[PDB]
Design a protein around this motif. Sequence first.
Motif, PDB file in Angstrom:
ATOM      1  N   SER A  81       0.767  -1.045   0.287  1.00  0.00           N
ATOM      2  CA  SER A  81       0.147  -0.005  -0.103  1.00  0.00           C
ATOM      3  C   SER A  81       1.118   1.201  -0.333  1.00  0.00           C
ATOM      4  N   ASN A  82       0.544   2.248  -0.824  1.00  0.00           N
ATOM      5  CA  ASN A  82       1.042   3.069  -0.574  1.00  0.00           C
ATOM      6  C   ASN A  82       0.188   4.534  -0.320  1.00  0.00           C
ATOM      7  N   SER A  83       0.384   5.773  -0.072  1.00  0.00           N
ATOM      8  CA  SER A  83      -0.661   6.341   0.555  1.00  0.00           C
ATOM      9  C   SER A  83      -0.161   7.704   0.129  1.00  0.00           C
ATOM     10  N   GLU A  84      -0.789   8.932   1.280  1.00  0.00           N
ATOM     11  CA  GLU A  84      -0.174  10.490   1.221  1.00  0.00           C
ATOM     12  C   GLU A  84       0.024  11.226   2.040  1.00  0.00           C
ATOM     13  N   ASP A  85       0.022  10.499   3.541  1.00  0.00           N
ATOM     14  CA  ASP A  85       0.823  11.137   4.514  1.00  0.00           C
ATOM     15  C   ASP A  85       2.270  11.437   4.354  1.00  0.00           C
ATOM     16  N   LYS A  86       2.546  11.536   3.682  1.00  0.00           N
ATOM     17  CA  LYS A  86       4.194  11.091   3.319  1.00  0.00           C
ATOM     18  C   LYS A  86       4.277   9.494   2.797  1.00  0.00           C
ATOM     19  N   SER A  87       3.475   8.626   2.277  1.00  0.00           N
ATOM     20  CA  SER A  87       3.987   6.984   3.007  1.00  0.00           C
ATOM     21  C   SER A  87       3.658   6.030   1.791  1.00  0.00           C
ATOM     22  N   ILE A  88       4.698   4.999   2.148  1.00  0.00           N
ATOM     23  CA  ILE A  88       4.396   3.650   1.513  1.00  0.00           C
ATOM     24  C   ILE A  88       3.921   2.792   2.755  1.00  0.00           C
ATOM     25  N   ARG A  89       2.569   1.894   2.636  1.00  0.00           N
ATOM     26  CA  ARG A  89       2.533   1.428   3.762  1.00  0.00           C
ATOM     27  C   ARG A  89       2.532  -0.264   3.675  1.00  0.00           C
ATOM     28  N   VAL A  90       2.376  -0.988   4.659  1.00  0.00           N
ATOM     29  CA  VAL A  90       3.020  -2.430   4.372  1.00  0.00           C
ATOM     30  C   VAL A  90       2.159  -2.566   4.871  1.00  0.00           C
ATOM     31  N   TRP A  91       1.751  -4.075   4.334  1.00  0.00           N
ATOM     32  CA  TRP A  91       0.452  -4.629   4.760  1.00  0.00           C
ATOM     33  C   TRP A  91       0.771  -6.193   4.292  1.00  0.00           C
ATOM     34  N   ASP A  92      -0.012  -7.541   4.960  1.00  0.00           N
ATOM     35  CA  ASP A  92       0.734  -8.412   4.588  1.00  0.00           C
ATOM     36  C   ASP A  92      -0.804  -9.323   3.796  1.00  0.00           C
ATOM     37  N   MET A  93      -0.762  -9.925   3.730  1.00  0.00           N
ATOM     38  CA  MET A  93      -1.636 -10.727   3.033  1.00  0.00           C
ATOM     39  C   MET A  93      -2.381 -12.079   2.586  1.00  0.00           C
ATOM     40  N   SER A  94      -0.490 -12.905   3.259  1.00  0.00           N
ATOM     41  CA  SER A  94      -0.224 -14.387   3.580  1.00  0.00           C
ATOM     42  C   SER A  94      -0.978 -14.988   5.049  1.00  0.00           C
ATOM     43  N   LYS A  95      -1.038 -13.449   5.453  1.00  0.00           N
ATOM     44  CA  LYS A  95      -2.069 -14.292   6.637  1.00  0.00           C
ATOM     45  C   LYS A  95      -2.930 -12.715   7.083  1.00  0.00           C
ATOM     46  N   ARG A  96      -2.772 -11.652   6.252  1.00  0.00           N
ATOM     47  CA  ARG A  96      -2.844 -10.608   6.228  1.00  0.00           C
ATOM     48  C   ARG A  96      -2.996  -9.564   8.085  1.00  0.00           C
TER      49      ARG A  96
END
Lengths: 281, 161
Positions: A266-281
């Motif tokens: 994930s990536n976003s706008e507070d100055k960010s890239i945000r990190v997510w799972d999705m293997s167990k999420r």
Amino acid sequence: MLTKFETKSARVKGLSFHPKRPWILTSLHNGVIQLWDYRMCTLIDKFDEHDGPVRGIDFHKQQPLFVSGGDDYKIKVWNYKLRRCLFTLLGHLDYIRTTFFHHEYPWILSASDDQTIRVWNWQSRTCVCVLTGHNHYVMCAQFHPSEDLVVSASLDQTVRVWDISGLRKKNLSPGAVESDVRGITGVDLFGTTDAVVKHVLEGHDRGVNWAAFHPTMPLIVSGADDRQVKIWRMNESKAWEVDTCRGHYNNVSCAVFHPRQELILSNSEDKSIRVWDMSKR
Amino acid sequence: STENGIIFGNIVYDVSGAASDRNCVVLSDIHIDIMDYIQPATCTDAEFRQMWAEFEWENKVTVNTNMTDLNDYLQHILKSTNMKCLTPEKALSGYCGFMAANLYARSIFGEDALANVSIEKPVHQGPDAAVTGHIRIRAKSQGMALSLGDKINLSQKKTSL
């Protein structure tokens, strides 16, 4: 391990990484299309496809060529390598998001951001397909599992999934049991971009930034024009799937699947890239 | 001819995949260095000194360490770069010397490069099997100039490339 090269510039709407090369071809809405065959930290060419913005980038499918879209509304395929234009048609009333190349008689599909996408014969001249089911402004257009089955994401707040034909759209079937596209606990909405119940999926999430597909599968991973980037599986179709993808501060423009990685980035706008799972999420 | 200012060469080059070939080699070169290019060249010493100081000061590299005396070593380096040490004073490159050697060279595309390297020099329990001499390199761009100091640094010794 290393970030080999890095200058922040470009205001980037559309993007692609070379499945064959370590190129990145990048579409800016600066009106720019760029191929840099990223390897030697060098741009091969750079054409600002028109005065107006550029949203789209897609592959031809071959080795090193671009099929490109601008606010020109034109599908151009130009080979970097051959620095030349392959066959040419302009575009409807919006830009071209995805393209696919086929060849019974060296035959062609073009996917578009407006109205229709038309699939054309320049050999034994007949119609392989007509796709209507888009309106204007496609954020992320996609080939499906079946490559020539497809999904589209819109600024018309719909999603389109289409069925094609060799003489235009149709499918024959009669065996299934329930549906995950729509048939048991949870499931997400139809949108409107077309008018045939394949499934037009609701692209309302203030509009959908990106759509991404699950090859054999119909799970979508999405960028959305909401903080909510809402994830739905149509290979399940959970409840608390009414998930809003949350920063801390605003947005989630996109969040994506990596072919290999069973993960979401994930990536976003507070100055960010945000990190997510999705293997167990 | 053909100016391309992609220094030290190291410019991408293509052999292409364009026919019985799906790929090929795209390559950038490396292997393109200085020590060779420059030829020796010469000067009047007073004027020289004046000049030495005067020149593009901006680069230096240090000499210190080897495998030899700067007799054989110096000769070797000299030949390797094909470049000039302008003049001796007999003070003595032998008993020590405690000699600083002034070197000048001019290249194929015409840069003149100036050195004063001042160096200890081999001799039993007297001094020199290192240096701790400083090689002062002047070449117009610092970037090539220092790089030259390096290049020479590569040149200086003899080991597994």
